[PDB]
Design a protein around this ligand. Sequence first.
Ligand SMILES: [Mg+2]
Ligand SMILES: [Mg+2]
Ligand SMILES: [Mg+2]
Ligand SMILES: [Mg+2]
Ligand SMILES: [Mg+2]
Ligand SMILES: [Mg+2]
Ligand SMILES: [Mg+2]
Ligand SMILES: [Mg+2]
Ligand SMILES: [Mg+2]
Ligand SMILES: [Mg+2]
Ligand SMILES: [Mg+2]
Ligand SMILES: [Mg+2]
Lengths: 120, 78, 105, 140, 42, 166, 55, 192, 64, 97
Amino acid sequence: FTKSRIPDKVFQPKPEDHEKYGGDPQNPHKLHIVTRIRSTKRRPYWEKDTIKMLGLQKAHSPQIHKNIPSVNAKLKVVKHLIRIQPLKLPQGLPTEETMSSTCLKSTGELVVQWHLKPVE
Amino acid sequence: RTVSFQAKESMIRRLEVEAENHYWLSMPYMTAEQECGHAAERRAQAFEAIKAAATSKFPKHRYIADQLDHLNISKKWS
Amino acid sequence: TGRGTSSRFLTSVLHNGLGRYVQQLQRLSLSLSRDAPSSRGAREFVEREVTDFARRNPGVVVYVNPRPCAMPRIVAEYLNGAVREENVNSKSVEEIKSLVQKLAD
Amino acid sequence: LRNRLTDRYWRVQEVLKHAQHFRGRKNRCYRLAVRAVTRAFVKCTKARRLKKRNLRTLWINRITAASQEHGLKYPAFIVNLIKCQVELNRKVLVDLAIYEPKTFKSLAALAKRRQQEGFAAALGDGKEPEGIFSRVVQYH
Amino acid sequence: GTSLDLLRSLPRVSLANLKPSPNSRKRERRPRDRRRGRKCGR
Amino acid sequence: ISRKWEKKNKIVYPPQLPGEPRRPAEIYHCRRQIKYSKDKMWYLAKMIRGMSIDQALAQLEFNDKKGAQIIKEVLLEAQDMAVRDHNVEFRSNLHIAESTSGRGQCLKRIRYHGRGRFGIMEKVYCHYFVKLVEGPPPPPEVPKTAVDHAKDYIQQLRSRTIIHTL
Amino acid sequence: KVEGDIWALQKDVEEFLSPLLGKTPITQVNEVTGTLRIKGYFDEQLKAWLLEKGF
Amino acid sequence: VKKGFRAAFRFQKELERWRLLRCPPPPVRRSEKPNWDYHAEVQAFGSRLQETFSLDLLKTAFINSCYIKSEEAKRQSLNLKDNQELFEQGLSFSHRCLTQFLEDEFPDLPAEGTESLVSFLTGEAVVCHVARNLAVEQLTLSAEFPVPLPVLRQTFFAVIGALLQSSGPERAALFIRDFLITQMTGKELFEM
Amino acid sequence: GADNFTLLGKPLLRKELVRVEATVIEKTESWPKINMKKNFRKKKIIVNPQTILRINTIEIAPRL
Amino acid sequence: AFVRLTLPPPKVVDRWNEKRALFGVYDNIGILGNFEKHPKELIKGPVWLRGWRGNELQRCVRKKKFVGNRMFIEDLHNLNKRISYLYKHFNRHGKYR
RNA sequence: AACGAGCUUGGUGAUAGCUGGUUACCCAAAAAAUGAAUUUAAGUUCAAUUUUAAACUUGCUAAAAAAACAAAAUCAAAAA
RNA sequence: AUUAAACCUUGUACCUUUUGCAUAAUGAACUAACUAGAAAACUUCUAACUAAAAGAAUUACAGCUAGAAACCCCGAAACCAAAC
Ligand SMILES: [Mg+2]
Ligand SMILES: [Mg+2]
Ligand SMILES: [Mg+2]
Ligand SMILES: [Mg+2]
Ligand SMILES: [Mg+2]
Ligand SMILES: [Mg+2]
Ligand SMILES: [Mg+2]
Ligand SMILES: [Mg+2]
Ligand SMILES: [Mg+2]
Ligand SMILES: [Mg+2]
Ligand SMILES: [Mg+2]
Ligand SMILES: [Mg+2]
C-alpha cells in the first residue's frame, strides 16, 4: 500500500459537468470552502498530515483556502475525506464596516448583512 | 453474504460528493508560474515571530514586595 | 450515588415569586480571632465588605463575633429552618466574599 | 512506631457510607465494600449519558402512540411538521400529546395537510402553484 | 531605601514568619502514590 | 465485657399524672456463662417468644433439651422478682416480651486427630436474656384476608403517575 | 551591587546596548539581590560604560 | 496508645453526633440561643417583607397573653399591651379582604362557599404553615415552646393588624393577597 | 395555546402577539455528581451553578 | 480502626524556660570572639560525630575508629556486621551504576 | 518419625540474571519488541528512539527538471 | 430510575500476568494491627563573595562556597567452623 498518483483525466471536466454543477470553465472561483466529513483514523499517515496542514482537524467546520495549484495538490490527497464548495460573495467582499456582520450560508454564500429578520 | 440496502445507498452518496470534488478541483484560479512569490512577505514575517519567541526565553524578575509580603501573614487587630 | 441518596422535586418555600419575592437567608454569624493567621482573610472581610453586604441585604441580620478562635466559621440560617455552617479557615477576602453571596441567594 | 497513621477510621468511613445500601458483606467489609463502591461509581457515570438516549426513546414511543391515534405514522408527523417551519422538539411534543390533546390534534391535521400538499406538488409535474401551507418564510 | 520603609509598616519579623527563598528547595517524592508507586520507577 | 441488661432494671420514670394510661411494668433478667451453645439455645428462646408466663413454663417442663431447664429457672427467678421488686400484683399477669441468646466468653482447646494432627476445639458458652412485661400476651397476628389483599392491589394502581413528563 | 532604583539602571542599559544588538536586550532584574542580569556577553562594553559614569 | 491529640478531638465530634440521633434534644426557643438581638430581628422582619412598620406596634403584635402570665408568676416568686386588640382588627379585616377578593374572582360562588374558603385560608393549618416560614414563631413571645398552633395563628393576624394601622388597608390587602391567597394555588374547589 | 385556540410561529411568534414574564427566585448549585472514567480515588465531583425561574404571566393581544 | 474515647491530658509547653529562652547563644563565638573557638566545639554528642556528618556506612566506620577498642564483644560483632552489610549494598546494589 | 549423607548454633540480612510483593491526589508527555556484541540469547551494555532544560535557525509536506539502475524508494533550486 | 424494597432497562468480579485479549492462569474466608527506595561523581535550582572562593591542606582561563535534590522488601537447594 503506497501513495497513488491519479490520472490527469480525472480532473478534466466535461461539457455536461459544467451544466450539472453550474460552474463556468472561465472566470474560475477564487476561494474554496473545505470541510472534513470523514475521520483520519484508519487512514495512512500522509493523509493524516495533510489534514493538519490544511487546518481541517475538526469535522464539519469550514476552512477557507486558495484555489491555487499548490493548495489544490494537497486537497487532491485528501479528496475523499473532505467536501469542497466554491465560496460565493453575493454582496461583494466584506469591508471594514461589514466585517462584524457577516455570515457564511450552507449554500456557499458569505452574506455581509445578517439581520435575522423576515425577508418581507 | 449480501450487502444491505443501507450500505450500497450511503456509499453512492459519498461517491457523488467526491465526484463534485473532482470538478471543483479542475479550475485553478492561478497558474503555477503566476503563483510564485505572491505570499512571500507573510511567510517571512511568520517565521520571524517563531524565532522571536524561541530566543526570548529568560528567567523572570524577582521583587522585594513579594518576599516582604509574607510578613503580612501575621497581621492582626491591635 | 442516586440510589444511595435521597431525592426531591423542584419547589419553593412559600410560592416565593407569586406575590412578592422574599429573601430566604435571614441570619449570618461570623466568628473571628483578633490575632490568628487562619482568620486573616475573614478579618479583612469585616473591615471592607461586611457593611456593604449588610446594606444590600436589610432582611439578613449579621452577627460578627471577634473572640479567641481557632477556625473562623460562618453560620447561615434560613426562614424554612435550614442551618448551614462553613469553615472559613485561611480563606482570602475574595473567597469569603464569594461564599457569602452564594448563601444569600 | 515513631509515626503511625491516626486517621484510618475516617478513611474507612468514606468508602463505607457509599456501600451501606448494598446486600451482603459488601456493605460492611472494607475490602469487599471498596470494590463494590467503585463499580457503582463507574456505573453512575456511564448511566448519566445513557439516560439522555433512553428518554428520547421514550419520547418517540409516546409520540408514535399519539400520532397513530389520528392516523399518522411517526416519520410523517415529524417530517411534515418541520416542513411547516415548526421547531417544537420531541420532549415538548410529548407534553402536548399527554396534557394538550386538542392542540396535538391540530398539529396532526397540520402535518397531514402538509403531507397532502407534498403529494400533489410532486404528483403534478411542471409549474403548479405551491401549496398554501408549503410556503416557506425566508429570513435575512 | 524604599524597601526598608516597607518593613516599617509590616508586622514584626519572628520565627513564626520565616520563609525560604522561592524555589530554594526541591520537593522529594516518596514511592507512595500511584504515580510513583507500584513498580516504583524500576 | 458489657452488662447493660442488668442496669435496665434501675430506670425510674417520673410519677404519672392521674389522666394517663397505666404504664405496664417491665422486668429484665439474664443468666451469664451458660455451658450451652447459643445456637442451640436460640430454638428454646425462640419458642417461648410472645407466650405467657404459665404457657412458657408448661412448654419448658416437658422439653428434653438441657437449655430448657436452664431457661425455666431464669423465668422463675424473673417471675419472683417482678412481684417482689417491680410491684407486679399478679404472678400470672406476665408475658415474654423478649427472649434471646447471646454468645459468651469461650475457651480454646485441642481436639486430637489421627496423624499427629489437631484442631482448635471451642468450649462454647452463651448468655440468655428475657424481658417480661405485665399484662396479657398481645393478640396473635391474623393473616390478611382476600379483600384485604385486593384493596392493597388497588392502592398500588391508584398511586401510579405519568412517569418522566410534566 | 546596584543600589537605588534598579529599574532605572535597566532602562539605561537597554538604550546603551540596543544600537549594538539592533533589538531591545533581554534582561532580568533581581530586586532582592540588587543585581541586573543580561543575556549575552557585554562585560567589556558595560565596564567602560560604567567607568565614564564614575561608578 | 497512638500519639496525638487531634484524632481524639475528631472522634469526640462523632460521639456528639451519635448521641443526638439516639437521644434527640428537646427543641428550644431561638431566643435562648446565642447570636440574638430582639430589636434587630424585629426590624429585619419588617424589611424582609418589603414593608414599613411602626416598631412599637409590631412588638406588641408578637406579645401574647400567656407570656405575661408566666413573667408575672416568676416576678411573684409594666403591664404592657397584648396582641388581642390588634388580633381582632387583623382577623376582622382579613376576613373582609379575603371575602372581597373571592367574590370579585368568583361572583357566582354561593355565600356558603366563601365562608368555607375564608375559614380554610384563615384556618390553623394554613396560617400555621405560613406563619412558621415567615419567622413569626421565632419572634413570638409565649409561655410555651414550640408555640401552640392557636397562639401562632393569633399572633400572625395580630401582625396584619399592626400592618393595617401602620400602612393602611391598601398595603394590608396586598399582604393578604401575597401570602394567604397564594395558599389556594393548585387546590381544587371541593378540597377546600 | 388556550382552551379553544392556539397560535404557532414559523418558527417564532411576533413580539406583539405574546409576552411572557418570569422572575428569578433562587441561584444555587447542583448536588455533587460523580464522574469516574480504576481506583476509588480516581473520581471527580461536579457541581454546576443553577437558577430557578418562576413564570408569572402569559399575555396575548389582538394583533393577528 | 478504633479511636480514643477520651481526650488525652492537655500538653503544656513552657516556652520561656532557661533552655528555650537562651537557645542559640554563643553561636557566633568565632566571628564575634576573634576565632579562638569554632562553633562546632560547642556541640554535645557522641565522640565520633561532633562537628562531622556522613552516611550510615561512613558513620559506622568512624564510630569503630574512635571507640572500637572500648566496645563490648556483642556490640563490636554487630557493628562489624553492619559495616559489611552496608559495604555490599552501597558498592554492588542499586539502580545507578 | 525426611540421611546420596545427621542435628544445633555461628559465618549469615549467604547468594538467587528466578517467583511473588512493593502503601495519598492531580496535570502532562510517552516509546520499543530495529540494529550490534555477549558461556549471550528468562540477562546486560551501546546505537536507535523518547524525554527534560538551554542556545539559535530553518524544519515538515510537496519538490520540477537530471541525474545513479529505471517508466519510485535515494537525490532534490524556486514556490505554496 | 420510580409513587413504589423487588419486576423494567444497562452491565463478561478484582490484583498480577500474560501481549496492548481472555470465559486463561496465579493470589485473596473476613476484621484489626504490622509489613517494602537508602547514598551527591556529573547535571539542575536558590543564595554568599567574586579573579578569586573556602574557618589551614582544596579548586580556579567566572569561578568557588553553602543549601536543596537519589538508587526496595520477602524466599532456596547449598558451603564452611565449632559443639551435641
Ligand atoms: Mg442519541
Ligand atoms: Mg503419636
Ligand atoms: Mg473449628
Ligand atoms: Mg535475595
Ligand atoms: Mg538469566
Ligand atoms: Mg522495524
Ligand atoms: Mg563482527
Ligand atoms: Mg566468550
Ligand atoms: Mg524549498
Ligand atoms: Mg499454564
Ligand atoms: Mg528518597
Ligand atoms: Mg557456589
